[PDB]
Protein backbone atom coordinates (compact mmCIF):
# COMPACT_ATOMS: atom_id res chain seq x y z
CA UNK A 1 0.00 0.00 0.00
CA UNK A 2 1.04 3.58 -0.71
CA UNK A 3 0.32 5.90 2.21
CA UNK A 4 -2.44 8.56 1.96
CA UNK A 5 -0.06 11.53 1.95
CA UNK A 6 -1.83 13.07 -1.00
CA UNK A 7 -5.02 12.92 1.05
CA UNK A 8 -3.27 14.98 3.72
CA UNK A 9 -1.19 17.54 1.81
CA UNK A 10 -3.85 18.02 -0.86
CA UNK A 11 -6.81 17.88 1.52
CA UNK A 12 -9.40 20.41 0.39
CA UNK A 13 -10.00 21.93 3.80
CA UNK A 14 -7.64 22.64 6.68
CA UNK A 15 -8.49 23.41 10.34
CA UNK A 16 -7.40 26.34 12.55
CA UNK A 17 -4.30 25.90 14.70
CA UNK A 18 -6.15 25.76 18.03
CA UNK A 19 -8.34 23.03 16.52
CA UNK A 20 -5.49 21.25 14.75
CA UNK A 21 -6.36 17.84 13.40
CA UNK A 22 -4.30 14.65 13.45
CA UNK A 23 -4.29 11.68 11.12
CA UNK A 24 -2.25 8.57 11.85
CA UNK A 25 -0.42 6.75 9.06
CA UNK A 26 0.17 3.01 9.28
CA UNK A 27 0.52 -0.35 7.52
CA UNK A 28 1.76 1.28 4.32
CA UNK A 29 4.78 2.20 2.21
CA UNK A 30 5.77 5.87 2.19
CA UNK A 31 7.74 7.44 -0.63
CA UNK A 32 8.96 10.69 0.88
CA UNK A 33 10.72 11.97 -2.23
CA UNK A 34 7.21 12.84 -3.48
CA UNK A 35 7.50 15.83 -1.17
CA UNK A 36 11.22 16.00 -0.40
CA UNK A 37 12.04 17.62 -3.77
CA UNK A 38 8.88 19.62 -4.48
CA UNK A 39 9.61 23.33 -4.93
CA UNK A 40 6.11 23.36 -3.45
CA UNK A 41 7.17 23.87 0.19
CA UNK A 42 8.65 27.09 1.55
CA UNK A 43 9.45 25.30 4.80
CA UNK A 44 10.71 21.74 5.12
CA UNK A 45 12.73 21.33 8.31
CA UNK A 46 13.21 17.90 9.91
CA UNK A 47 14.51 17.03 13.37
CA UNK A 48 16.76 14.09 14.09
CA UNK A 49 15.70 12.52 10.81
CA UNK A 50 17.34 14.33 7.89
CA UNK A 51 14.84 14.77 5.05
CA UNK A 52 16.97 12.89 2.49
CA UNK A 53 17.54 9.67 4.47
CA UNK A 54 13.80 9.56 5.16
CA UNK A 55 12.78 6.88 2.66
CA UNK A 56 15.64 4.61 3.78
CA UNK A 57 13.89 3.87 7.10
CA UNK A 58 11.01 2.16 8.91
CA UNK A 59 8.57 3.23 11.65
CA UNK A 60 5.67 1.72 13.58
CA UNK A 61 3.47 4.72 12.84
CA UNK A 62 3.59 8.20 11.35
CA UNK A 63 1.30 10.93 12.63
CA UNK A 64 0.42 13.96 10.53
CA UNK A 65 -0.90 17.15 12.12
CA UNK A 66 -2.62 19.72 9.90
CA UNK A 67 -3.48 23.37 10.53
CA UNK A 68 -3.26 26.93 9.26
CA UNK A 69 -1.11 29.71 10.68
CA UNK A 70 0.01 33.18 9.68
CA UNK A 71 3.27 33.44 7.74
CA UNK A 72 5.04 35.09 10.65
CA UNK A 73 3.84 32.29 12.91
CA UNK A 74 5.30 29.37 10.97
CA UNK A 75 8.52 29.96 12.90
CA UNK A 76 6.72 29.03 16.12
CA UNK A 77 6.12 25.52 14.78
CA UNK A 78 9.45 24.18 15.98
CA UNK A 79 10.65 22.74 19.29
CA UNK A 80 11.65 25.21 21.98
CA UNK A 81 9.57 28.12 20.73
CA UNK A 82 7.30 30.52 22.62
CA UNK A 83 4.40 32.74 21.67
CA UNK A 84 0.62 32.73 21.40
CA UNK A 85 0.89 29.92 18.84
CA UNK A 86 3.50 27.63 20.47
CA UNK A 87 2.15 28.21 23.98
CA UNK A 88 -1.62 28.18 23.45
CA UNK A 89 -2.34 26.40 20.17
CA UNK A 90 0.14 23.73 19.14
CA UNK A 91 3.49 22.85 20.67
CA UNK A 92 6.24 20.43 19.71
CA UNK A 93 8.25 18.47 22.29
CA UNK A 94 11.92 19.20 22.91
CA UNK A 95 13.08 15.76 21.75
CA UNK A 96 10.94 16.12 18.63
CA UNK A 97 11.34 13.36 16.06
CA UNK A 98 9.72 14.51 12.82
CA UNK A 99 9.41 17.08 10.03
CA UNK A 100 7.47 20.32 9.65
CA UNK A 101 6.24 21.24 6.18
CA UNK A 102 4.55 24.50 5.24
CA UNK A 103 3.49 26.21 2.03
CA UNK A 104 1.90 29.54 1.15
CA UNK A 105 -1.82 29.31 0.34
CA UNK A 106 -2.83 32.93 -0.29
CA UNK A 107 -4.86 32.17 -3.41
CA UNK A 108 -6.65 29.48 -1.44
CA UNK A 109 -7.27 30.70 2.10
CA UNK A 110 -6.98 34.44 1.44
CA UNK A 111 -9.74 36.70 0.16
CA UNK A 112 -9.92 40.10 -1.52
CA UNK A 113 -12.09 41.53 1.25
CA UNK A 114 -10.43 39.38 3.92
CA UNK A 115 -10.97 35.92 5.42
CA UNK A 116 -11.29 35.77 9.19
CA UNK A 117 -12.50 32.18 9.53
CA UNK A 118 -9.15 30.86 10.76
CA UNK A 119 -8.51 31.55 14.43
CA UNK A 120 -5.97 30.94 17.21
CA UNK A 121 -6.21 30.91 21.04
CA UNK A 122 -4.59 33.97 22.61
CA UNK A 123 -5.79 33.59 26.19
CA UNK A 124 -5.39 30.54 28.40
CA UNK A 125 -4.68 29.62 32.00
CA UNK A 126 -1.32 27.91 31.66
CA UNK A 127 0.22 26.73 28.40
CA UNK A 128 0.04 23.45 26.51
CA UNK A 129 2.26 20.41 26.84
CA UNK A 130 3.71 18.96 23.63
CA UNK A 131 0.92 17.60 21.40
CA UNK A 132 -1.86 18.86 23.67
CA UNK A 133 -4.98 20.27 22.01
CA UNK A 134 -7.56 22.70 23.42
CA UNK A 135 -10.88 23.55 21.74
CA UNK A 136 -12.63 24.74 24.91
CA UNK A 137 -14.02 28.10 23.84
CA UNK A 138 -15.09 29.34 27.28
CA UNK A 139 -15.31 33.07 28.11
CA UNK A 140 -11.91 33.91 29.60
CA UNK A 141 -11.30 35.81 32.82
CA UNK A 142 -8.01 36.85 34.44
CA UNK A 143 -9.02 35.28 37.77
CA UNK A 144 -10.40 32.05 36.33
CA UNK A 145 -13.83 33.41 37.23
CA UNK A 146 -16.64 32.10 34.97
CA UNK A 147 -18.19 35.11 33.23
CA UNK A 148 -20.33 36.14 30.27
CA UNK A 149 -19.75 39.22 28.08
CA UNK A 150 -20.55 42.08 27.80
CA UNK A 151 -19.29 41.46 31.37
CA UNK A 152 -16.16 43.38 32.42
CA UNK A 153 -12.73 41.70 32.20
CA UNK A 154 -14.35 38.91 30.21
CA UNK A 155 -12.95 38.18 26.74
CA UNK A 156 -13.44 35.34 24.26
CA UNK A 157 -10.23 33.19 24.14
CA UNK A 158 -10.05 32.90 20.36
CA UNK A 159 -8.83 35.73 18.10
CA UNK A 160 -9.32 35.88 14.30
CA UNK A 161 -6.58 35.77 11.67
CA UNK A 162 -7.09 38.36 8.92
CA UNK A 163 -6.20 36.79 5.59
CA UNK A 164 -6.13 39.08 2.54
CA UNK A 165 -4.78 38.55 -0.95
CA UNK A 166 -3.03 41.92 -0.80
CA UNK A 167 -0.99 41.99 2.41
CA UNK A 168 2.67 41.16 2.99
CA UNK A 169 3.66 37.51 2.81
CA UNK A 170 4.04 37.39 6.60
CA UNK A 171 0.36 38.19 7.06
CA UNK A 172 -0.58 35.58 4.48
CA UNK A 173 -2.09 32.12 5.20
CA UNK A 174 0.13 29.02 5.45
CA UNK A 175 -0.95 25.39 5.51
CA UNK A 176 1.25 23.31 7.80
CA UNK A 177 1.70 19.55 8.10
CA UNK A 178 3.72 18.20 11.02
CA UNK A 179 5.03 14.68 10.41
CA UNK A 180 5.77 12.88 13.66
CA UNK A 181 7.64 9.58 13.43
CA UNK A 182 6.79 7.01 16.08
CA UNK A 183 9.25 4.30 17.10
CA UNK A 184 7.52 1.75 19.31
CA UNK A 185 8.72 -1.80 19.95
CA UNK A 186 6.14 -3.32 17.59
CA UNK A 187 7.88 -3.76 14.20
CA UNK A 188 7.53 -1.16 11.44
CA UNK A 189 4.51 -0.93 9.15
CA UNK A 190 5.50 2.28 7.37
CA UNK A 191 8.78 2.08 5.44
CA UNK A 192 10.10 3.30 2.10
Amino acid sequence: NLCPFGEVFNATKFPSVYAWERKKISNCVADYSVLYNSTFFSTFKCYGVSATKLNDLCFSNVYADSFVVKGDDVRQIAPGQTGVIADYNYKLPDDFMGCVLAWNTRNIDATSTGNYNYKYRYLRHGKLRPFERDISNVPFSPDGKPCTPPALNCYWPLNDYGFYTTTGIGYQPYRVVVLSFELLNAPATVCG
Partner: antibody
Framework: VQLQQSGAEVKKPGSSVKVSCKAS????????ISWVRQAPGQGLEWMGG????????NYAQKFQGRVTITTDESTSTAYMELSSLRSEDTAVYYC???????????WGQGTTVTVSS | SYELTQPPSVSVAPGKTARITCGGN??????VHWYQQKPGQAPVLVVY???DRPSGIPERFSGSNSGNTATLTISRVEAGDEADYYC??????????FGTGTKVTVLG
Protein backbone atom coordinates in the same frame (compact mmCIF):
# COMPACT_ATOMS: atom_id res chain seq x y z
CA VAL B 1 0.36 55.28 -5.17
CA GLN B 2 3.47 57.10 -3.85
CA LEU B 3 4.76 57.51 -0.29
CA GLN B 4 5.46 60.71 1.60
CA GLN B 5 7.85 60.60 4.55
CA SER B 6 8.56 63.05 7.34
CA GLY B 7 11.51 65.45 7.29
CA ALA B 8 15.10 64.78 8.37
CA GLU B 9 15.84 64.54 12.08
CA VAL B 10 18.79 64.86 14.46
CA LYS B 11 18.88 63.17 17.89
CA LYS B 12 21.14 62.82 20.93
CA PRO B 13 22.33 59.31 21.71
CA GLY B 14 19.98 57.43 24.00
CA SER B 15 16.90 59.36 22.94
CA SER B 16 14.28 58.19 20.46
CA VAL B 17 12.88 59.18 17.08
CA LYS B 18 9.59 58.66 15.26
CA VAL B 19 9.24 58.86 11.49
CA SER B 20 5.98 59.04 9.56
CA CYS B 21 4.90 57.65 6.18
CA LYS B 22 1.72 58.79 4.45
CA ALA B 23 0.11 57.16 1.43
CA SER B 24 -0.36 59.62 -1.43
CA UNK B 25 -3.86 58.19 -1.70
CA UNK B 26 -4.91 58.91 1.87
CA UNK B 27 -5.05 55.31 3.08
CA UNK B 28 -2.95 52.15 2.95
CA UNK B 29 -6.00 50.14 1.90
CA UNK B 30 -5.35 46.43 2.37
CA UNK B 31 -1.61 46.29 1.82
CA UNK B 32 1.42 46.19 4.10
CA ILE B 33 3.98 48.90 4.81
CA SER B 34 7.59 47.96 5.62
CA TRP B 35 10.47 49.92 7.18
CA VAL B 36 13.95 49.65 5.74
CA ARG B 37 17.11 51.47 6.82
CA GLN B 38 20.52 52.08 5.30
CA ALA B 39 23.52 53.48 7.16
CA PRO B 40 26.03 55.52 5.05
CA GLY B 41 27.82 53.45 2.42
CA GLN B 42 26.14 50.38 3.88
CA GLY B 43 23.55 47.92 2.64
CA LEU B 44 19.79 47.67 3.20
CA GLU B 45 18.22 46.22 6.33
CA TRP B 46 14.62 45.33 7.18
CA MET B 47 13.48 46.71 10.51
CA GLY B 48 9.86 45.68 10.56
CA GLY B 49 6.42 46.33 9.15
CA UNK B 50 2.71 46.64 9.79
CA UNK B 51 -0.58 45.91 8.05
CA UNK B 52 -2.72 48.97 8.90
CA UNK B 53 -6.02 47.23 8.15
CA UNK B 54 -5.08 44.48 10.62
CA UNK B 55 -3.54 46.82 13.15
CA UNK B 56 -0.79 44.26 13.74
CA UNK B 57 2.94 44.95 13.35
CA ASN B 58 6.08 42.82 13.14
CA TYR B 59 9.75 43.36 13.93
CA ALA B 60 13.17 42.01 13.05
CA GLN B 61 15.12 40.04 15.67
CA LYS B 62 17.77 42.76 15.86
CA PHE B 63 15.33 45.57 16.65
CA GLN B 64 13.00 43.52 18.82
CA GLY B 65 12.39 45.70 21.86
CA ARG B 66 13.68 48.99 20.43
CA VAL B 67 11.18 49.49 17.61
CA THR B 68 7.48 50.26 17.61
CA ILE B 69 5.53 50.44 14.37
CA THR B 70 2.05 51.95 14.53
CA THR B 71 -0.74 53.71 12.67
CA ASP B 72 -2.94 56.68 13.47
CA GLU B 73 -6.60 56.11 14.26
CA SER B 74 -7.74 57.04 10.76
CA THR B 75 -5.23 54.38 9.64
CA SER B 76 -3.87 56.81 7.01
CA THR B 77 -0.40 57.29 8.50
CA ALA B 78 2.20 54.76 9.65
CA TYR B 79 4.88 55.57 12.22
CA MET B 80 8.23 54.05 13.10
CA GLU B 81 9.63 54.86 16.53
CA LEU B 82 13.14 53.70 17.40
CA SER B 83 14.41 53.98 20.98
CA SER B 84 17.76 54.08 22.78
CA LEU B 85 19.32 55.74 19.75
CA ARG B 86 23.03 55.25 19.06
CA SER B 87 25.43 56.55 16.42
CA GLU B 88 25.29 53.15 14.74
CA ASP B 89 21.62 54.02 14.16
CA THR B 90 22.49 57.07 12.06
CA ALA B 91 20.97 56.26 8.69
CA VAL B 92 18.35 56.81 6.03
CA TYR B 93 14.97 55.33 6.86
CA TYR B 94 12.57 54.23 4.15
CA CYS B 95 9.00 53.01 4.29
CA UNK B 96 7.86 50.78 1.45
CA UNK B 97 4.82 48.89 0.27
CA UNK B 98 5.16 45.12 0.51
CA UNK B 99 4.88 43.09 -2.65
CA UNK B 100 2.52 40.13 -2.51
CA UNK B 101 5.44 37.75 -3.10
CA UNK B 102 7.72 38.77 -0.23
CA UNK B 103 9.36 41.91 -1.54
CA UNK B 104 8.97 45.68 -1.61
CA UNK B 105 7.11 47.55 -4.32
CA UNK B 106 6.76 51.29 -3.76
CA TRP B 107 9.44 53.14 -1.80
CA GLY B 108 9.21 56.47 0.01
CA GLN B 109 11.80 59.20 -0.63
CA GLY B 110 13.44 58.26 2.66
CA THR B 111 14.03 60.10 5.93
CA THR B 112 17.55 60.99 6.95
CA VAL B 113 18.15 60.54 10.67
CA THR B 114 21.42 61.55 12.34
CA VAL B 115 22.35 60.46 15.87
CA SER B 116 25.11 62.49 17.53
CA SER B 117 25.96 64.54 20.62
CA SER C 1 19.39 33.39 10.25
CA TYR C 2 19.16 33.06 6.48
CA GLU C 3 21.90 34.67 4.39
CA LEU C 4 22.31 35.80 0.79
CA THR C 5 25.53 36.15 -1.18
CA GLN C 6 26.41 38.61 -3.93
CA PRO C 7 29.77 39.52 -5.43
CA PRO C 8 30.84 43.03 -4.36
CA SER C 9 31.74 44.09 -7.92
CA VAL C 10 31.07 43.40 -11.59
CA SER C 11 32.68 45.26 -14.51
CA VAL C 12 31.30 45.36 -18.03
CA ALA C 13 31.99 47.25 -21.25
CA PRO C 14 29.12 49.20 -22.82
CA GLY C 15 26.51 47.30 -24.83
CA LYS C 16 27.59 43.99 -23.31
CA THR C 17 25.52 42.05 -20.78
CA ALA C 18 26.28 41.99 -17.06
CA ARG C 19 25.29 39.12 -14.78
CA ILE C 20 24.81 39.34 -11.01
CA THR C 21 24.41 36.17 -8.97
CA CYS C 22 22.65 35.80 -5.63
CA GLY C 23 23.53 32.77 -3.55
CA GLY C 24 21.30 31.20 -0.94
CA ASN C 25 20.30 27.82 0.43
CA UNK C 26 17.70 26.43 -1.97
CA UNK C 27 16.96 30.00 -3.05
CA UNK C 28 14.93 28.48 -5.87
CA UNK C 29 12.16 27.72 -3.41
CA UNK C 30 12.10 31.44 -2.60
CA UNK C 31 10.80 34.41 -4.57
CA VAL C 32 13.79 36.60 -5.44
CA HIS C 33 13.59 40.39 -5.71
CA TRP C 34 16.18 42.72 -7.25
CA TYR C 35 16.67 46.39 -6.47
CA GLN C 36 18.60 49.06 -8.31
CA GLN C 37 19.91 51.99 -6.30
CA LYS C 38 21.81 54.81 -7.95
CA PRO C 39 24.07 57.28 -6.07
CA GLY C 40 22.13 59.16 -3.40
CA GLN C 41 18.73 57.85 -4.59
CA ALA C 42 16.17 55.45 -3.17
CA PRO C 43 16.03 51.76 -4.12
CA VAL C 44 13.99 50.76 -7.17
CA LEU C 45 12.44 47.33 -7.87
CA VAL C 46 13.84 46.13 -11.20
CA VAL C 47 12.88 42.49 -10.94
CA TYR C 48 10.36 40.81 -8.67
CA UNK C 49 9.24 37.22 -8.20
CA UNK C 50 12.35 35.83 -9.91
CA UNK C 51 11.87 37.14 -13.44
CA ASP C 52 9.12 39.67 -13.87
CA ARG C 53 9.63 43.32 -14.71
CA PRO C 54 7.50 45.95 -13.07
CA SER C 55 5.84 48.26 -15.59
CA GLY C 56 8.45 50.85 -16.55
CA ILE C 57 11.61 48.77 -16.39
CA PRO C 58 13.48 48.06 -19.67
CA GLU C 59 13.33 44.53 -21.06
CA ARG C 60 17.11 44.66 -20.70
CA PHE C 61 16.62 43.60 -17.07
CA SER C 62 15.77 39.96 -16.46
CA GLY C 63 16.19 37.49 -13.63
CA SER C 64 16.29 33.76 -13.08
CA ASN C 65 16.21 31.53 -10.02
CA SER C 66 16.96 27.83 -9.56
CA GLY C 67 18.89 25.69 -7.09
CA ASN C 68 21.02 27.92 -4.87
CA THR C 69 21.56 30.71 -7.38
CA ALA C 70 19.36 33.52 -8.67
CA THR C 71 20.70 35.78 -11.38
CA LEU C 72 20.07 39.30 -12.57
CA THR C 73 20.94 39.81 -16.21
CA ILE C 74 21.32 43.21 -17.84
CA SER C 75 21.68 43.12 -21.61
CA ARG C 76 23.24 45.99 -23.57
CA VAL C 77 24.45 47.88 -20.50
CA GLU C 78 24.42 51.68 -20.51
CA ALA C 79 26.48 54.10 -18.42
CA GLY C 80 23.14 54.84 -16.79
CA ASP C 81 23.02 51.31 -15.42
CA GLU C 82 25.78 51.99 -12.93
CA ALA C 83 24.45 51.47 -9.44
CA ASP C 84 24.31 49.04 -6.56
CA TYR C 85 22.13 45.98 -7.16
CA TYR C 86 20.57 44.17 -4.23
CA CYS C 87 18.81 40.83 -4.22
CA UNK C 88 16.20 40.12 -1.57
CA UNK C 89 13.96 37.34 -0.28
CA UNK C 90 11.65 36.51 2.63
CA UNK C 91 12.31 33.58 4.94
CA UNK C 92 9.94 32.24 7.62
CA UNK C 93 12.70 32.55 10.24
CA UNK C 94 14.60 35.67 9.17
CA UNK C 95 11.84 37.78 7.65
CA UNK C 96 13.06 39.91 4.72
CA UNK C 97 16.73 39.35 3.88
CA PHE C 98 18.88 41.52 1.62
CA GLY C 99 22.12 40.51 -0.04
CA THR C 100 25.29 42.49 0.70
CA GLY C 101 24.80 44.17 -2.69
CA THR C 102 26.73 44.37 -5.97
CA LYS C 103 28.30 47.47 -7.50
CA VAL C 104 28.09 47.51 -11.30
CA THR C 105 30.72 49.46 -13.21
CA VAL C 106 30.68 50.21 -16.92
CA LEU C 107 34.13 50.34 -18.47
CA GLY C 108 35.40 52.27 -21.47
Amino acid sequence: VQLQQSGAEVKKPGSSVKVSCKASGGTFSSYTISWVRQAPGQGLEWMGGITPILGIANYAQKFQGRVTITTDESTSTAYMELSSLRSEDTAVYYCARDTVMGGMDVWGQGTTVTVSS
Amino acid sequence: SYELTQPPSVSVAPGKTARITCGGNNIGSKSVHWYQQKPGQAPVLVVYDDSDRPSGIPERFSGSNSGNTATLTISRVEAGDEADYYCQVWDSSSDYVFGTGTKVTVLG
